[PDB]
Design a protein around this ligand. Structure first.
Ligand SMILES: CCCCCC(=O)CC(=O)O
Ligand SMILES: CCCCCC(=O)CC(=O)O
Lengths: 333, 333
């Protein structure tokens, strides 16, 4: 999976792919949580003293869930205030998960924490404050709902003003938070290795050179996708473009850097890692594009289109898009 | 520009991009030539003793023309028999253009030859026979209509059974002909260098290794796009996919290997080379997808849709697609 934030004159744009091995194909769904919903956490957090068993939705939230391999875990969310939260795989955190220390805050199962954040908070700084004040914690050491083992993930929050927070579990089980804006290197997030190692790798490349991407090794790995996203986003020029053209330019640039095709094997894993679906957001205006790489089809919609709903709703959005749907058919949850 | 042929259970699929420097952006148009049309060649062929001044359309043909830099030259065509012809840049032929020897055949201006071939012939073998019998030749040494200088292009013919011919002007002005099917390396064609040099380059890579694309240097040049298309198409696995999924699979695999993003400079040229538009064809059923990378938008249609036209017709297809058209508006030529 790869994620790119790009400041544009029409809004803060975010693009993200969901990638996995071909032997456990992804299946993207979406849920709508309206303001006032009484929410019950999925799963357990038995490793933690206190659980975020129940909460109320404060901000209208659309949550993209992965049903094919992650049991319905919420991996990409947005809310009516333009906050976006996301979880991406971070395999280098796996040995450290059981070392996360319970800080006594109510722990949120990793199936729900991404959505929880958007449901409760409006800005990146708010989320940082809530973490620091102990209003919640990520249940790092607990299996996601319905799964056997704690998942190696990393998290980030991007707000409508381009403030970014990266949350990563590092050696010894420590939680490292990185902050930056949408012009910083935190605009790009992929998978392993950990962010320090990406930064180390990147020192060899002069991003000012417009030919720099041609000097970078290619692979399907997180390392190479991070480097190439940073290179190609640095020389993206959005001046003079219409909104459609700006959206497309981010899409095409992102795809060249980061779309993973089927069939290529990573020698570091002995497995493939194709992209299954992707989302693009304008955090300033509610625009969303969901694209399935299984069908090559995409639909555009807007979060505001879902405020009509007074109780939670659900759609098998990837399936629908794959059958050629042009509009989402919502079901009561 | 890059072109990939892929055999599938649903038909012979062909995908091609049109790439150029961002200082002279492409603008694709399309012309339709119905059966029985009395055609008049565009431009002159004064370097040759006999001109293909006139011909008759035998096979219903759709011709994609490049109007932004190439004066309206026909660069990608298809007919009602499932024959596809195409011209792609081949800068390494430039030194040899004026050395092509006139064999006395009626010579076709390079603005039209691609369309001419689809309009006369049904199969790759037929075109090779026509060349060998002197029915026509390509006017290699003559400027395309409306342009100052002979253009450095190479041509290929791909028929509905997957037979491929590459026609490439090499040392001494020799017209070199390469034959193979859609499982040969000729299924991939890009730009410079010449085909023998791509083949030499490729000897270092074992395409049977599923990790081989990870071992290949990346750049925007023809060399690296040929290599990557060969690698990624080797491990493309179309088993069990639906038609939609198969089309998407070729598209995604092709894009990963060969879509050229804006902003990246080739150190070999000091220039960029972004993809402006692409075409996908099912040669067995007439399906056509035209995608603009400037808008990100695409239209699907079928050659059959144009079979009712009783006079030649034209459409500014890229312009229409970029404005959000869902169907093509045609005008009389
Ligand atoms: C909705 C996104 C998927 C959620 C599961 C993941 O974390 C996998 C990833 O894409 O890295
Ligand atoms: C219709 C496609 C464009 C025709 C002009 C070219 O031959 C250039 C290329 O893409 O290399």
């Amino acid at each position: 999976s790869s994620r790119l934030v790009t400041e544009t004159q029409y809004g803060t744009m975010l693009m993200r792919t969901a990638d996995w091995v071909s032997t456990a194909p992804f299946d993207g769904h979406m849920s709508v949580f309206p303001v006032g919903t009484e929410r019950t956490m999925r799963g357990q957090v038995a490793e933690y003293q206190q659980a975020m068993t129940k909460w109320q939705t404060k901000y209208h939230t659309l949550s993209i869930e992965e049903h094919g391999a992650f049991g319905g875990l919420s991996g990409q969310t947005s809310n009516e205030k333009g906050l976006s939260v996301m979880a991406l795989s971070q395999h280098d955190s796996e040995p450290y998960l059981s070392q996360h220390k319970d800080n006594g805050a109510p722990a949120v199962n990793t199936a729900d924490v991404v959505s929880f954040i958007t449901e409760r908070y409006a800005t990146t700084a708010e989320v940082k404050a809530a973490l620091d004040n102990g209003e919640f914690q990520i249940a790092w050491a607990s299996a996601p709902n319905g799964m056997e083992h704690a998942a190696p993930l990393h998290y980030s929050v991007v707000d409508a003003d381009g403030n970014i927070m990266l949350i990563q579990l590092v050696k010894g089980g420590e939680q490292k938070i990185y902050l930056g804006d949408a012009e910083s290197d935190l605009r790009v997030k992929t998978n392993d290795p950990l962010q320090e190692k990406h930064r180390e790798y990147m020192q060899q490349f002069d991003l000012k050179d417009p030919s720099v991407a041609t000097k970078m090794p290619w692979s399907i790995g997180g390392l190479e996708r991070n480097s190439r996203l940073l290179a190609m986003s640095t020389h993206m020029d959005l001046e003079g473009l219409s909104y459609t053209e700006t959206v497309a330019r981010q899409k095409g640039t992102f795809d060249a850097a980061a779309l993973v095709p089927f069939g290529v094997q990573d020698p570091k894993t002995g497995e493939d890692y194709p992209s299954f679906f992707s989302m693009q957001y304008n955090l300033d205006n509610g625009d969303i594009w969901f694209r399935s790489l299984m069908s090559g089809k995409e639909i555009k919609f807007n979060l505001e289109d879902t405020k009509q709903f007074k109780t939670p709703m659900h759609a098998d959005i990837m399936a629908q898009v794959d059958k050629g749907a042009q509009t989402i058919t919502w079901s009561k949850m």
